[PDB]
Design an enzyme around this catalytic site. Structure first.
Site, PDB file in Angstrom:
ATOM      1  N   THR A  17      41.542  43.610  28.561  1.00 28.72           N
ATOM      2  CA  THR A  17      42.181  43.827  29.853  1.00 28.72           C
ATOM      3  C   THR A  17      42.625  45.276  30.009  1.00 28.72           C
ATOM      4  O   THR A  17      42.660  45.814  31.122  1.00 28.72           O
ATOM      5  CB  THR A  17      43.371  42.880  30.015  1.00 28.72           C
ATOM      6  N   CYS A  35      51.269  49.639  61.065  1.00 27.91           N
ATOM      7  CA  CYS A  35      51.610  48.319  60.545  1.00 27.91           C
ATOM      8  C   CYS A  35      52.651  47.701  61.474  1.00 27.91           C
ATOM      9  O   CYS A  35      53.800  48.147  61.517  1.00 27.91           O
ATOM     10  CB  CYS A  35      52.124  48.419  59.114  1.00 27.91           C
ATOM     11  SG  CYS A  35      52.145  46.864  58.216  1.00 27.91           S
ATOM     12  N   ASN A  89      42.947  37.213  33.426  1.00 30.21           N
ATOM     13  CA  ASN A  89      42.550  35.975  32.766  1.00 30.21           C
ATOM     14  C   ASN A  89      41.056  35.953  32.469  1.00 30.21           C
ATOM     15  O   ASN A  89      40.651  35.924  31.304  1.00 30.21           O
ATOM     16  CB  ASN A  89      42.936  34.770  33.623  1.00 30.21           C
ATOM     17  N   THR A  90      40.230  35.980  33.512  1.00 26.53           N
ATOM     18  CA  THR A  90      38.787  35.893  33.335  1.00 26.53           C
ATOM     19  C   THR A  90      38.136  37.265  33.448  1.00 26.53           C
ATOM     20  O   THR A  90      37.753  37.689  34.543  1.00 26.53           O
ATOM     21  CB  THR A  90      38.175  34.937  34.360  1.00 26.53           C
ATOM     22  N   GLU A 126      43.627  37.311  41.423  1.00 26.02           N
ATOM     23  CA  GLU A 126      43.266  38.593  40.839  1.00 26.02           C
ATOM     24  C   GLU A 126      43.097  39.670  41.896  1.00 26.02           C
ATOM     25  O   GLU A 126      43.337  40.859  41.636  1.00 26.02           O
ATOM     26  CB  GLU A 126      41.976  38.453  40.026  1.00 26.02           C
ATOM     27  CG  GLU A 126      41.824  37.120  39.321  1.00 26.02           C
ATOM     28  CD  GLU A 126      42.582  37.039  38.014  1.00 26.02           C
ATOM     29  OE1 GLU A 126      43.731  37.524  37.947  1.00 26.02           O
ATOM     30  OE2 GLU A 126      42.023  36.483  37.047  1.00 26.02           O
ATOM     31  N   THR A 155      48.279  40.794  32.593  1.00 27.14           N
ATOM     32  CA  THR A 155      46.984  40.504  31.993  1.00 27.14           C
ATOM     33  C   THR A 155      46.000  39.952  33.018  1.00 27.14           C
ATOM     34  O   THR A 155      46.382  39.393  34.049  1.00 27.14           O
ATOM     35  CB  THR A 155      47.144  39.506  30.847  1.00 27.14           C
TER      36      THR A 155
END
Ligand SMILES: [Zn+2]
Lengths: 320, 304, 74
Positions: free
Chosen positions: A226, A65, A220-221, A291, A218
């Site tokens: 979850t 890295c 969402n979609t 996400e 959480t």
């Protein structure tokens, strides 16, 4: 053109100054991560600061890295380090050239760490280690490894390494190619917390506060709940490294995880230097861009926990 | 002379009392896991100025450090730890914590100033460790240097306070285990400038009953060494180097007193190294002195 | 309580400095400091005296304004 080569600049604008802006999309986790970083690298403690930055350099160079290595050498030069030390590992004293064996195992094959390595590190001689001095270094190495994995996973743009490493061609080998670690005989919450608190209290408190921020995050979609697919991804990445839970039924892994995501996880974890844009775009095509960052955060936490549990079990076996 | 009482306000027994370098502060530690610091005012009355929880078990000993490094204290506990505290501008903060022990840590002692900033600790498993602080400007970086291993359980340690350049560093360690056998209870270790390691130097064979405390004497002028032991009786020894591996000594015996008719618990010299004070199970403090014919008399009996 | 525009006229400052020099000549040294305090409180345009400062041997920076004993820089 902006922060990340994968996330579009418009998305970042709508949703080490680059990592901090790509990780800021989940506020409740950034604060905890920054607190732990400040404790580990800036507050006074058992090791000197320059030694800490050199440890960070050594750990980040395993996964190749450039970002972290550049930042940490810039910091090391300005805290009172020896410029001679930056020519290679062979110029450093014979107390940092002992961590170089545990480095590979923590980075590549955690399941091979045993109590003999700890005994070799703590054996009496002319250049030895203390327990606190070594428990700090272990946490530092794991932190740098996970950070490198995340940095490569999200594809962050900027703004040698072969001289800082021994055995450059070790790499990762699959587990099934060794006894299984039952996740009820040695759990973080019941066993590891107590030991890490007795040997290094503030670090243990901060790590336990950081572990509980990556659980209450959480999705969402989703489309079950979850809490289900989070468990699935967590258990899968733990199983990659050799830890099997007794209560969990492992069939649901396929029924809940697309086959495209299953490869992104493994690439970003085991070999984070080979991740690419097409891989980033193959999985979860029609979902929000915030996400594929949560997945990375979960992966980072899981890798940290696995490595720490193995090292702590080794230390406990040594001290008993 | 005159005795004045002090209200300690400790919830359990007191295990140690220590004075400071300039003689006007005092520290007390108890089994309620607490440490207290006292100061003395112009009117000559002692009053407490700090108290804070220090460990999670009984605290056995507490010792001061030289005022060149600051106001520093060290403690040892039943929870297998040792801590270093400093006073900043007024509360006391924690600077380090040493956690290498596997059993209870029994005594802690600071090294004489001319070696630097060193600390020695002893355990109930028979291991004695020596630490160091290479940079005085950070009191949170200690590093282990040496590790001795005795055969029995240690109870007390003591440094040699001589400051001569013809004496090498040495430390004496005593045991307290009661066994049906008869083994030596006091040993002396010496440093070797050539091999850079501590090596065994002498063994006090005559001492067989359990030991509770030992203490060297403040040299200030001499060419030999004086050692005091608190066993079932009071014993005083003498070690004189022979003209020139470990240095060879000629160990003798110069005093033995069974005047307590009890078990002796503590010993303490004075600033010049001429008067010895001892405490016993009866509850009285006794003072010993030597005349020009090398006989050790008694000088006073202090009773609480 | 004059405005900051008139206190910057290079005629009031001349008068103040002349008064201070007169106070110096008579060897009235505590009165001058008393006047200086009450003048710095009201008029903030003028800076106080410039003098020496102590510098660290290893940096070269100033030790003026975390051991109390160590240099704030190195
Ligand atoms: Zn400086």
């Amino acid at each position: 053109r902006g922060p990340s080569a994968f996330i579009p600049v418009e998305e970042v604008l709508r949703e080490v100054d680059n990592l901090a802006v790509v990780m800021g999309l989940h506020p409740d986790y950034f604060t905890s991560f920054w607190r732990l970083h400040y404790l580990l690298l800036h507050t006074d403690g058992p090791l000197a600061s320059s030694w800490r930055h050199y440890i960070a350099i050594m750990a980040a160079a395993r996964h190749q890295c450039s970002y972290l290595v550049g930042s940490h050498m810039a910091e090391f030069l300005q805290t009172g380090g020896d410029p001679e030390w930056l020519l290679g590992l062979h110029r450093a004293p014979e107390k940092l050239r002992k961590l170089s064996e545990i480095n590979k195992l923590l980075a590549h094959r955690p399941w091979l760490i045993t109590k003999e390595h700890i005994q070799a590190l703590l054996k009496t001689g002319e250049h030895t280690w203390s327990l606190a001095e070594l428990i700090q270094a272990l946490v530092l190495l794991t932190h740098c490894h996970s950070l490198s994995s995340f940095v490569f996973g999200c594809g962050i743009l900027p703004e040698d390494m072969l001289c800082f490493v021994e055995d450059p061609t070790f790499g990762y080998e699959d587990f099934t190619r060794p006894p299984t670690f039952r996740a009820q005989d040695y759990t973080w919450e019941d066993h590891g917390y107590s030991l890490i608190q007795r040997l290094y209290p503030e670090g243990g408190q901060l790590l336990d506060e950081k572990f509980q921020a990556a659980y209450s995050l959480t999705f969402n979609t989703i489309a079950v709940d979850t809490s289900v697919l989070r468990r699935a991804i967590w258990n899968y990445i733990h199983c990659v490294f050799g830890i099997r839970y007794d209560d969990y039924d492992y069939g649901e892994v396929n029924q809940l995880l697309e086959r495209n995501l299953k490869v992104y996880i493994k690439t970003v974890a085991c070999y984070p230097e080979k991740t690419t844009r097409r891989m980033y775009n193959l999985f979860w095509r029609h979902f929000r861009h915030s996400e594929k960052v949560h997945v990375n955060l979960l992966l980072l936490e899981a890798r940290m926990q696995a490595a720490l549990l193995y090292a702590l079990r080794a230390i406990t076996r040594y001290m008993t | 002379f005159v005795a004045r009482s002090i209200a300690a306000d400790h919830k359990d027994l007191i295990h140690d009392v220590s004075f400071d370098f300039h003689g006007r502060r005092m520290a007390t530690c108890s089994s309620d896991q607490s440490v207290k610091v006292w100061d003395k005012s112009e009117s000559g009355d002692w009053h407490c100025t700090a108290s804070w929880k220090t460990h999670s078990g009984s605290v056995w000993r507490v010792t001061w450090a030289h005022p060149e490094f600051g106001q520093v204290l060290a403690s040892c506990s039943f929870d297998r730890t040792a801590a270093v505290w400093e006073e900043i501008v007024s509360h006391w903060v924690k600077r380090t914590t040493l956690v290498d022990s596997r059993t209870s840590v029994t005594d802690v002692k600071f090294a004489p100033k001319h070696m630097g900033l060193m600390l020695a600790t002893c355990s109930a498993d028979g291991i004695v460790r020596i630490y160091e602080a290479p940079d005085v400007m950070n009191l949170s970086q200690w590093s282990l240097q040496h590790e001795i291993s005795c055969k029995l359980s240690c109870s007390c340690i003591s440094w040699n306070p001589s400051s001569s350049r013809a004496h090498s560093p040495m430390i004496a360690v005593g045991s307290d285990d009661s066994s049906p056998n008869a083994m030596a209870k006091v040993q002396i270790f010496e440093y070797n400038e050539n091999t850079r390691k501590y090596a065994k130097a002498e063994t006090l064979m005559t001492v067989t009953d359990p030991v509770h405390d030992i203490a060297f004497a403040p040299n200030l002028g001499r060419s030999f060494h004086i050692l005091a032991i608190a066993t079932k009786d009071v014993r005083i020894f003498t070690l004189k180097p022979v003209r020139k591996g470990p240095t060879k000594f000629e160990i003798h015996i110069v005093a033995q007193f069974d005047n307590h008719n009890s078990q002796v618990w503590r010993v303490s010299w004075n600033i010049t190294g001429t008067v010895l004070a001892s405490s016993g199970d009866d509850g009285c403090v006794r003072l010993w002195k030597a005349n020009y014919m090398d006989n050790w008399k008694c000088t006073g009996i202090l009773k609480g | 309580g004059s405005p900051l525009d008139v206190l910057k006229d290079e005629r009031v400052q001349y008068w103040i400095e002349n008064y201070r020099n007169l106070l110096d000549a008579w060897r009235f040294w505590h009165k001058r400091a008393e006047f200086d305090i009450h003048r710095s409180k009201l008029d903030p345009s003028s800076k106080p005296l410039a003098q020496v400062f102590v510098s660290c041997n290893f940096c070269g920076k100033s030790i003026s304004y975390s051991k109390v004993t160590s240099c704030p820089g190195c």
